[PDB]
């Protein structure tokens, strides 16, 4: 199988309301994730090497 939530990891209830990164591994509530949003998209926008695309 190739599934996933199937490793040990902590336990929390609350785990719905906090955000998490796929590239930075923080986790926010909602207003301070607005800081993350903005960093992440600049470092993201920013990290663009080895570009290729025409018609
Ligand atoms: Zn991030």
Redesign the pocket.
């Known amino acids: 199988g190739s599934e996933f939530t199937s490793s040990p990891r902590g336990d929390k209830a609350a785990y719905d309301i906090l955000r998490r ?4 591994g ?1 986790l926010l509530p909602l207003p301070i994730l607005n800081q ?1 949003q903005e ?2 998209r600049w ?1 993201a926008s920013s990290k663009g090497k080895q570009v290729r695309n025409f018609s």
């Open positions: 990164c796929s590239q930075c923080i993350h960093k992440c470092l």
